[PDB]
Design an enzyme around this catalytic site. Structure first.
Site, short mmCIF file in Angstrom:
data_model
loop_
_atom_site.label_atom_id
_atom_site.label_comp_id
_atom_site.label_asym_id
_atom_site.label_seq_id
_atom_site.Cartn_x
_atom_site.Cartn_y
_atom_site.Cartn_z
N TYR A 1 -73.08 -12.32 -33.49
CA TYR A 1 -72.84 -13.49 -32.53
C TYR A 1 -72.38 -14.79 -33.17
CZ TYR A 1 -73.05 -16.48 -28.27
OH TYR A 1 -72.73 -17.33 -27.23
N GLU A 38 -54.17 -12.61 2.31
CA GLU A 38 -53.60 -13.57 1.35
C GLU A 38 -52.07 -13.65 1.47
OE1 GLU A 38 -57.18 -14.93 -1.08
OE2 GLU A 38 -55.33 -15.80 -0.26
N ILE A 90 -45.47 -18.46 -9.89
CA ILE A 90 -46.33 -18.20 -8.75
C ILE A 90 -47.04 -16.88 -8.82
CG2 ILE A 90 -46.10 -17.58 -6.26
CD1 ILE A 90 -44.10 -20.04 -6.33
N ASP A 101 -50.29 -30.95 -3.20
CA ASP A 101 -49.97 -32.25 -2.59
C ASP A 101 -49.56 -31.87 -1.20
OD1 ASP A 101 -47.09 -31.66 -2.32
OD2 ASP A 101 -46.94 -32.06 -4.48
N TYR A 105 -45.97 -28.65 2.32
CA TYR A 105 -46.69 -28.19 3.48
C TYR A 105 -47.64 -29.30 3.80
CZ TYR A 105 -45.48 -23.35 1.73
OH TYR A 105 -44.87 -22.19 1.20
N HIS A 112 -55.82 -23.12 -3.13
CA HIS A 112 -56.27 -22.79 -4.47
C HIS A 112 -55.13 -22.54 -5.46
CE1 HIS A 112 -60.09 -21.57 -2.24
NE2 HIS A 112 -60.20 -22.82 -2.65
N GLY A 113 -53.93 -22.28 -5.00
CA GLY A 113 -52.87 -21.80 -5.96
C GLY A 113 -53.10 -20.44 -6.59
N1 LIG Z 1 -77.14 -21.85 -24.20
C1 LIG Z 1 -76.24 -21.06 -24.81
N2 LIG Z 1 -76.58 -20.49 -25.96
C2 LIG Z 1 -75.73 -19.67 -26.60
N3 LIG Z 1 -74.51 -19.42 -26.17
C3 LIG Z 1 -74.06 -19.94 -25.02
C4 LIG Z 1 -74.92 -20.79 -24.28
N4 LIG Z 1 -74.21 -21.22 -23.22
C5 LIG Z 1 -73.01 -20.66 -23.26
N5 LIG Z 1 -72.89 -19.87 -24.33
C6 LIG Z 1 -71.72 -19.12 -24.69
O1 LIG Z 1 -70.55 -19.64 -24.05
C7 LIG Z 1 -69.96 -18.58 -23.26
C8 LIG Z 1 -69.25 -19.14 -22.03
O2 LIG Z 1 -70.24 -19.64 -21.12
P1 LIG Z 1 -69.86 -19.84 -19.53
O3 LIG Z 1 -68.59 -20.59 -19.56
O4 LIG Z 1 -70.99 -20.46 -18.86
O5 LIG Z 1 -69.55 -18.32 -19.05
P2 LIG Z 1 -70.38 -16.95 -19.06
O6 LIG Z 1 -71.88 -17.31 -19.13
O7 LIG Z 1 -70.08 -16.39 -17.66
O8 LIG Z 1 -69.76 -16.22 -20.22
C9 LIG Z 1 -71.09 -17.62 -22.91
O9 LIG Z 1 -70.61 -16.31 -22.62
C10 LIG Z 1 -71.83 -17.68 -24.24
O10 LIG Z 1 -71.20 -16.85 -25.21
N1 LIG Z 2 -44.15 -16.48 1.80
C1 LIG Z 2 -43.92 -17.57 1.05
N2 LIG Z 2 -42.88 -18.34 1.34
C2 LIG Z 2 -42.62 -19.45 0.64
N3 LIG Z 2 -43.35 -19.83 -0.38
C3 LIG Z 2 -44.44 -19.15 -0.77
C4 LIG Z 2 -44.77 -17.97 -0.05
N4 LIG Z 2 -45.84 -17.44 -0.68
C5 LIG Z 2 -46.18 -18.24 -1.68
N5 LIG Z 2 -45.35 -19.28 -1.76
C6 LIG Z 2 -45.42 -20.33 -2.74
O1 LIG Z 2 -46.17 -19.93 -3.88
C7 LIG Z 2 -47.28 -20.84 -4.05
C8 LIG Z 2 -48.48 -20.15 -4.69
O2 LIG Z 2 -49.03 -19.24 -3.72
P1 LIG Z 2 -50.58 -18.72 -3.89
O3 LIG Z 2 -50.66 -18.28 -5.30
O4 LIG Z 2 -50.85 -17.71 -2.87
O5 LIG Z 2 -51.43 -20.09 -3.72
P2 LIG Z 2 -51.54 -21.21 -2.57
O6 LIG Z 2 -51.08 -20.57 -1.25
O7 LIG Z 2 -53.06 -21.44 -2.50
O8 LIG Z 2 -50.72 -22.33 -3.16
C9 LIG Z 2 -47.57 -21.42 -2.68
O9 LIG Z 2 -48.22 -22.68 -2.74
C10 LIG Z 2 -46.13 -21.55 -2.19
O10 LIG Z 2 -45.52 -22.72 -2.73
MG LIG Z 3 -51.73 -18.47 -0.89
#
Ligand SMILES: Nc1ncnc2c1ncn2[C@@H]1O[C@H](COP(=O)(O)OP(=O)(O)O)[C@@H](O)[C@H]1O
Ligand SMILES: Nc1ncnc2c1ncn2[C@@H]1O[C@H](COP(=O)(O)OP(=O)(O)O)[C@@H](O)[C@H]1O
Ligand SMILES: [Mg+2]
Ligand SMILES: [Mg+2]
Lengths: 369, 369
Positions: A1, A38, A90, A101, A105, A112-113
Site C-alpha cells: 500500500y 438518456e 460528447i 450555460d 438550450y 450533467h454532461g
Molecule cells: N483515511 C485514509 N487512509 C488511507 N488511505 C485513504 C484514506 N482516505 C482515502 N484514502 C485513499 O484515497 C483513495 C481515494 O479515496 P476516495 O476518493 O474517497 O475514493 P474511494 O474511497 O471510493 O476509493 C482511496 O481508495 C484510498 O486509497
Molecule cells: N440529439 C442531440 N441533438 C443535438 N445535440 C445533442 C444531442 N444529444 C446530445 N447533444 C449534445 O451533446 C451534449 C452532451 O450530451 P450528454 O452527454 O447526454 O449531456 P447533457 O445532456 O447532460 O449535456 C449535450 O449537452 C448537447 O449539446
Molecule cells: Mg443528455
C-alpha cells in the site's frame, strides 16, 4: 500500500467499472431502459428548444435501439481545445456538453454532461449519424472507443441526430431485452408534455408501432390517466405559469378510487422519488382546501401531473429521481395556492364533490376507531 | 449552436457545477453531513482492513470538521503516471483511488474513487496531514485547488491521516452548521459495526464529547435499539457467516410496538433505500416463519440489522442509498433461511411469542373488516 496502489480510471473506463452511480440498477431492467431515456432526453431537449418536431424510437430485431430526431444535429466541427470533433468529445468525455450555460438550450433535462457518453460507455456498439451544415456524418464506437474519426459520408438538406446502440451484456444482467411497453409509457407521457412533437415508436421484432402526437397537454394527460377510472367531478383543474424564471404547470382530477397517483417532472424528466415540486404541491393542496373548508363553514382518488421548468435544477443522483432545489418548492406552492383557490371559487360544484370525498375518508377512519 | 457551444469541465469543476449527483441534497443538511461521512468512511475502510484502531471526529468552533485516523496514511510518494504526489491525485482526480482491485482493501465501502475528492471540491478550504514512512506531510487546498505541493513538515513514528474541511456556502444552503446528533448516530452505529475500533466525537463549540467502543457487535446494536422499547422475547436472533465470498450478518428482535425498523448496511455504508440485502432478508423471513407455522399446526414491532460484506457491490447513486447487486439477495436469503429456522427450533418459546404477535396483527385487521 503506497503510491503504486492508486489507480486513475480515464475516459469512459470509470463508467464501465462502476455503472450504477451513472445508470442506476443494471440488474432489474430499469437501468437498461434508462439507456434509451438518456438518448431520448437529448432529443426532447432539442424539441424544448423549438428545433425538433419528430422523434422516432426503433427497437431493432438484433436488440439494439435507435433514436432519430430532426433537431440541429450534434456539432460536428473539430473542437479547438480537445482537437477532435465536438461529437467525439460528447461521446467520450464525461461532463462535456452544451447545457452548462443557457446559450444553446434555455431549459433542458440534461445538465450533467454525461448522459450519451454513459450510454456509449455501456454499449458494446454504438452508431452515430448526424445531419448538419449540409453534410451527413457518421462514426462507430465499440465499448465507448471510436473506430475512426467522425467522417462525412454524404450531402443533405436535413439536420438531425441518429444514435443506435447495442447494450453491453457484461454490464446488464437479468433483464437484457427491451420491453415495448416501458418505452411506450415514457414516450406517450412525453407527447402529452411536448405538444406538437411527433414521437414514433417501432418494434422491428413484431412490427408493432405507435405514433404519439397528443394535443391537449397535461390536461389531456390527466383525462387519459382517468380513462378507465371513474372521475367524480367534471372539471380538471389546470394551470401553466412562469414567474421568477420558474415554469409551473399542474393538472389534477379526483376519481372514486382510493389510490394516489402524482406524476412529477422537471424539464420533462420524471422524478420517481418526487422532491421539492411535490412538497410544494402538497403544501398548497393542504393550505388551499383547509381555507376552503374554513370559509364554507366546515390523497385518495387523486391523479395529478406537476411539471416544472427550471433553469438549473439540482438532482441528488445522476438518474434524476429526486429534485432537491428548494426554491422550486416555494414556486409551485405559491402558484398553486393562488390558482387552486380560484378554481374552487369558480367551480363550486366540483369543490363540494372533492371536499366531500376528503371528509368521507376522514369519517371512515373515525367510524373504524 | 456549434462546436464552440460544447464545454468540457475539468478537474473538480464538474462537482462544483453539479454537486447533487455526487453529494446528494445540498439544501436539507443531508449532503452537508454526508461530507463528513465520506471522510469517516475512508477511515473505516482502514479499520476493516485491520490497520486503524482509533478514529477522532471533531467539530471545530469555526464550523469545520476534522477526521483523524491511525491507519496507514494516504500514500505520499510521487505518482509515476500523474507526476504529483499520490495524495494530491486522490484529492483532485475523480475516479482515482486504491479500491478498484482488492490488493489494498479486501472489502471496502469506498469503490467509486470520488469521495474525498468530492469533499475537497465542495470545501472552501481543506487541510491534509498524513503520517507515513517516518514523515509528517501536509497540504492545503482551496475550493479543491492545492496551494502548494505535498510537503514534509516533520519526523514521526505514527501513521495516519488527518482531513479537516470547511464546507463551501456557495454550495450548501439552508442547513450550514454541523449537528452533533447526526454525526453521533452514525458514529455510534459504526462502533457496533466495528468492534475494537475506538471512535471519538468532540464538539469544540460546547465541549460535548462521546467515546464509542461498544463490544457486543450488531447483537448489542439491537439491544441498544430496543433500550426504551419493550422486547417481547428474550433471545436476540443473531448470526455472522461468510459463504461464496459474501459476508452476511443479521441480528433481530421483536418489541411490543407497531413500527418496523430495519437497518441495512453494505461494507459498513447504510442503505436508506434498502435493496437486494433487504429483499433477501424479507424473503427468508416470510419463508421461514410460514414453514414454522405449517409445521406447528397453524413487520410490526421488528428491529433488525442486516450487514453484508461484498467484494464489489453495486449502488444506483454515488451516495449509496440502495444496493442493487442481485447475487446479494440470494446470499442473505439462503443464510437466513438456514439459520433462522435453527433459531426457531432452538428457542421454541421465543418462536411462539413472535408468531403470536404476527397472528394478533392478522386477526386485528380481520376483526376490523
Ligand atoms: N483515511 C485514509 N487512509 C488511507 N488511505 C485513504 C484514506 N482516505 C482515502 N484514502 C485513499 O484515497 C483513495 C481515494 O479515496 P476516495 O476518493 O474517497 O475514493 P474511494 O474511497 O471510493 O476509493 C482511496 O481508495 C484510498 O486509497
Ligand atoms: N440529439 C442531440 N441533438 C443535438 N445535440 C445533442 C444531442 N444529444 C446530445 N447533444 C449534445 O451533446 C451534449 C452532451 O450530451 P450528454 O452527454 O447526454 O449531456 P447533457 O445532456 O447532460 O449535456 C449535450 O449537452 C448537447 O449539446
Ligand atoms: Mg443528455
Ligand atoms: Mg472514499
Amino acid at each position: 500500500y503506497d503510491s503504486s496502489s492508486i489507480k486513475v480510471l480515464k475516459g469512459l473506463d470509470a463508467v464501465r467499472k462502476r455503472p450504477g452511480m451513472y445508470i442506476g440498477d443494471t440488474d432489474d431492467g430499469t437501468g437498461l431502459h434508462h439507456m434509451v431515456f438518456e438518448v431520448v432526453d437529448n432529443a426532447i431537449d432539442e424539441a424544448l428548444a423549438g428545433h425538433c418536431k419528430e422523434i422516432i424510437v426503433t427497437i431493432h430485431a438484433d436488440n439494439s435501439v435507435s433514436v432519430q430526431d430532426d433537431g440541429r444535429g450534434i456539432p460536428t466541427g473539430i473542437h479547438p481545445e480537445e482537437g477532435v470533433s465536438a461529437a467525439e468529445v460528447i461521446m467520450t468525455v464525461l461532463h462535456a456538453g452544451g447545457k452548462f450555460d443557457d446559450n444553446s438550450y434555455k431549459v433542458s433535462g440534461g445538465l450533467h454532461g454525461v448522459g450519451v457518453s454513459v450510454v456509449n460507455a455501456l454499449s458494446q456498439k454504438l452508431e452515430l449519424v448526424i445531419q448538419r451544415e449540409g453534410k451527413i456524418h457518421r462514426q462507430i464506437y465499440e465499448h465507448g472507443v471510436p473506430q475512426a474519426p467522425l467522417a462525412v459520408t454524404g450531402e443533405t438538406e436535413k439536420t438531425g441526430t441518429m444514435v443506435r446502440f447495442w447494450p453491453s451484456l457484461e454490464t446488464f444482467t437479468n433483464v437484457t431485452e427491451f420491453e415495448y411497453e416501458i418505452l411506450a409509457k415514457r414516450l406517450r407521457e412525453l407527447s402529452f408534455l411536448n405538444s406538437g412533437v411527433s414521437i414514433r415508436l417501432r418494434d422491428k421484432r413484431d412490427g408493432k408501432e405507435d405514433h404519439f402526437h397528443y394535443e391537449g397537454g397535461i390536461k389531456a394527460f390527466v383525462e387519459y390517466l382517468n380513462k378507465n377510472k371513474t372521475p367524480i367531478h367534471p372539471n380538471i383543474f389546470y394551470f401553466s405559469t412562469e414567474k421568477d424564471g420558474i415554469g409551473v404547470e399542474v393538472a389534477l382530477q379526483w376519481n372514486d378510487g382510493f389510490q394516489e397517483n402524482i406524476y412529477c417532472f422537471t424539464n420533462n424528466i420524471p422524478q420517481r422519488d418526487g422532491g421539492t415540486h411535490l412538497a410544494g404541491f402538497r403544501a398548497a393542496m393542504t393550505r388551499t382546501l383547509n381555507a376552503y373548508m374554513d370559509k364554507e363553514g366546515y390523497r385518495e382518488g387523486l391523479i395529478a401531473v406537476v411539471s416544472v421548468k427550471v433553469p438549473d435544477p439540482k438532482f441528488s443522483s445522476q438518474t434524476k429521481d429526486k429534485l432537491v432545489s428548494s426554491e422550486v418548492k416555494s414556486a409551485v406552492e405559491q402558484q398553486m395556492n393562488e390558482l387552486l383557490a380560484e378554481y374552487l371559487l369558480e367551480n363550486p360544484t366540483d369543490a363540494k364533490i372533492v371536499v366531500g370525498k376528503i371528509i368521507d375518508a376522514a369519517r371512515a377512519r373515525e367510524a373504524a376507531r
